[PDB]
Amino acid sequence: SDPLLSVLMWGVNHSINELSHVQIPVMLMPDDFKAYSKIKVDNHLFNKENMPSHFKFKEYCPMVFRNLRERFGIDDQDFQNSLTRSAPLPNDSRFHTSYDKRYIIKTITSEDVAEMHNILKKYHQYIVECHGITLLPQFLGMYRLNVDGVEIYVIVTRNVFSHRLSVYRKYDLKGSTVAREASDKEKAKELPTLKDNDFINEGQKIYIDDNNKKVFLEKLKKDVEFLAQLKLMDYSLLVGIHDVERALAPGEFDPNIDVYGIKCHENSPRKEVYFMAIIDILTHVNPEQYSKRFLDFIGHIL
Amino acid sequence: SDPLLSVLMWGVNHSINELSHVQIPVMLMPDDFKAYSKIKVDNHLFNKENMPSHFKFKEYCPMVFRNLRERFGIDDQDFQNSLTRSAPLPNDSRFHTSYDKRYIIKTITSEDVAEMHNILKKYHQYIVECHGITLLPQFLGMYRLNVDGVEIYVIVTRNVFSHRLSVYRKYDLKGSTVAREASDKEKAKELPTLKDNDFINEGQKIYIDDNNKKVFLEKLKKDVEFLAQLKLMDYSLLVGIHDVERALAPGEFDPNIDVYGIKCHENSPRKEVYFMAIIDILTHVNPEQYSKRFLDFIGHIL
Ligand SMILES: CC(=O)c1c(C)c2cnc(Nc3ccc(N4CCNCC4)cn3)nc2n(C2CCCC2)c1=O
Numbered sequence: 001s002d003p004l005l006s007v008l009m010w011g012v013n014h015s016i017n018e019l020s021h022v023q024i025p026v027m028l029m030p031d032d033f034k035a036y037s038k039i040k041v042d043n044h045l046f047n048k049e050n051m052p053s054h055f056k057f058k059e060y061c062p063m064v065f066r067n068l069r070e071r072f073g074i075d076d077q078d079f080q081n082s083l084t085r086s087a088p089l090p091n092d093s094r095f096h097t098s099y100d101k102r103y104i105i106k107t108i109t110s111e112d113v114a115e116m117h118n119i120l121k122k123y124h125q126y127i128v129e130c131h132g133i134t135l136l137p138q139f140l141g142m143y144r145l146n147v148d149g150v151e152i153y154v155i156v157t158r159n160v161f162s163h164r165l166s167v168y169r170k171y172d173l174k175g176s177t178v179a180r181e182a183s184d185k186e187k188a189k190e191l192p193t194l195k196d197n198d199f200i201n202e203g204q205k206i207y208i209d210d211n212n213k214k215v216f217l218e219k220l221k222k223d224v225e226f227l228a229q230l231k232l233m234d235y236s237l238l239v240g241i242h243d244v245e246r247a248l249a250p251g252e253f254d255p256n257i258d259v260y261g262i263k264c265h266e267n268s269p270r271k272e273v274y275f276m277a278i279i280d281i282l283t284h285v286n287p288e289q290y291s292k293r294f295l296d297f298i299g300h301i302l
Numbered sequence: 303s304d305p306l307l308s309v310l311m312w313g314v315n316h317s318i319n320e321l322s323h324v325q326i327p328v329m330l331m332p333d334d335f336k337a338y339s340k341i342k343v344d345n346h347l348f349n350k351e352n353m354p355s356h357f358k359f360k361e362y363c364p365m366v367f368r369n370l371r372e373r374f375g376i377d378d379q380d381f382q383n384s385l386t387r388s389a390p391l392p393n394d395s396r397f398h399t400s401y402d403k404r405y406i407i408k409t410i411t412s413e414d415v416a417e418m419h420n421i422l423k424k425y426h427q428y429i430v431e432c433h434g435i436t437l438l439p440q441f442l443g444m445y446r447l448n449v450d451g452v453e454i455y456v457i458v459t460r461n462v463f464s465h466r467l468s469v470y471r472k473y474d475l476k477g478s479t480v481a482r483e484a485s486d487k488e489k490a491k492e493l494p495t496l497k498d499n500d501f502i503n504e505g506q507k508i509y510i511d512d513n514n515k516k517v518f519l520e521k522l523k524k525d526v527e528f529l530a531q532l533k534l535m536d537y538s539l540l541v542g543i544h545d546v547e548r549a550l551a552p553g554e555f556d557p558n559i560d561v562y563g564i565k566c567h568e569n570s571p572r573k574e575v576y577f578m579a580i581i582d583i584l585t586h587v588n589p590e591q592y593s594k595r596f597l598d599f600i601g602h603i604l
Pocket residue numbers: 091092094095104106137138155157158159160161170191192193278279280281
């Protein structure tokens with residue numbers, strides 16, 4: 001009963017079925033980065049229960065995104081199911097998550113789409129270079145939906161948080177000089193999103209061991225410098241904490257599905273798993289400063 | 303490598319997948335007879351190996367045709383497979399048959415489409431009345447294909463002939479006053495299509511028993527009178543003879559797939575199965591005369 005949502009599900013379904021007939025090459029050509037597929041549907045006096053009568057659906061660079069999915073260890077059939085088997089769920093009073101909590105579906109602006117197009121080749125090559133091991137967003141699909149006059153753009157990414165294990169505390173850190181704090185309107189929703197100073201206040205610590213910390217920051221440095229290089233800024237580190245005590249394995253996670261998980265070290269006051277990655281990178285006081293400033297912060301909290 | 307053919311296969315595939323999400327009602331509404339679905343595809347720098355970059359596909363009254371398929375004992379998944387699993391084969395120097403010889407795919411004119419629309423409700427009701435037992439064409443699907451500038455209309459019907467058992471001799475009878483005979487250009491192709499006088503010459507007999515003859519002509523009368531009633535004429539009886547001696551069951555056929563089969567009677571000079579039905583009905587000296595004249599002929603040859 002959300003028409004835009006059902007066009008998306010329809011669109012992803014259509015998209016993955018078409019690609020299932022297209023031979024997967026090992027390389028992308030420069031044209032794959034300029035490519036798209038467009039489908040206009042006009043149903044007259046037919047199929048009213050499921051679909052709108054008039055909708056358009058556009059996928060950007062379908063070959064590039066399939067290549068990315070593969071590189072992030074995502075199988076097209078699973079991706080299709082996660083997005084289609086049952087409707088994605090809305091998240092605030094905004095974004096959606098797939099019914100299985102695996103994927104995030106964010107509405108973005110035509111500006112954001114333009115920027116994504118702009119960085120896609122370099123983004124792809126970066127993913128190739130690091131063999132998919134990164135704390136960058138994992139962009140999996142990018143679409144344009146049209147439902148009789150309304151036009152929206154969506155991007156699909158991997159969830160930073162676990163699909164199984166809940167997260168009682170969420171942070172969003174930038175390490176900025178200006179003060180960042182959470183709304184009391186937000187604090188009163190079951191799961192709030194705290195910011196820099198909610199953290200830098202109530203004594204929040206991340207208990208990971210020195211190897212795990214080394215790996216993470218090495219990754220973060222490479223990622224962040226690549227973002228700097230692209231003149232990108234205003235991105236956050238999304239930090240989620242799962243308290244094992246409150247909520248198969250009786251506390252362990254699948255490291256091949258919940259890629260951003262790190263177990264706490266043995267002397268950790270409480271049994272905790274952490275989920276950390278970069279989010280929200282498509283905004284284009286300066287990029288080169290922001291990067292090292294962001295890195296300073298994350299170092300001092302870990 | 304025939305673009306129009308691959309849009310058809312693409313279109314049937316798309317059509318049956320969509321309908322698989324639509325609830326099947328037991329009744330059609332008057333709007334189902336005015337309905338259609340339209341899909342415009344624009345691929346830029348994508349999917350060139352399989353599809354054209356720009357094509358349109360239109361299905362007419364998709365609910366009505368699905369209802370007909372069901373009434374003729376055809377399952378949508380099978381129909382999808384017969385048309386998609388492998389390309390339909392061309393037939394002359396015209397029409398196509400599905401790779402499994404079950405369905406015929408004829409190109410028709412916009413006139414023919416208009417006439418089909420015109421008779422569809424009455425056609426449907428007739429099929430309902432006779433519980434699908436008829437010698438009329440079984441119309442299963444009707445489409446419009448557009449491949450960059452070229453526009454064609456196709457209709458899909460059940461084959462009059464068997465999908466397994468070959469047919470060494472084919473006739474096409476109208477019972478007309480003017481002389482009808484086959485071309486020598488035709489006679490020289492492996493399987494010719496003989497006409498009224500090729501039959502009325504070389505002593506062709508149809509050896510069926512008196513019950514089978516009674517059933518057939520009762521059917522034929524009802525069918526033909528319905529065609530008359532619609533002011534339709536210029537239709538033929540397509541007669542195919544299978545010689546058991548020349549070419550599982552060692553001579554018997556599936557009466558649920560090869561619906562138009564009749565075994566010969568026990569005293570038949572040779573072991574023969576006959577395949578007879580009406581074809582080519584969409585041309586709109588008069589209809590009422592043609593009918594009884596057609597019936598006179600078929601009576602005198604059986
Ligand atoms: C496109 C992004 O960079 C991006 C990613 C990758 C992402 C990944 N996992 C998320 N997983 C999340 C993020 C937040 C929650 N919450 C649960 C309850 N509501 C408040 C926060 C749950 N799951 N959220 C993500 N976002 C969201 C934050 C901005 C709007 C979408 C994103 O932009």
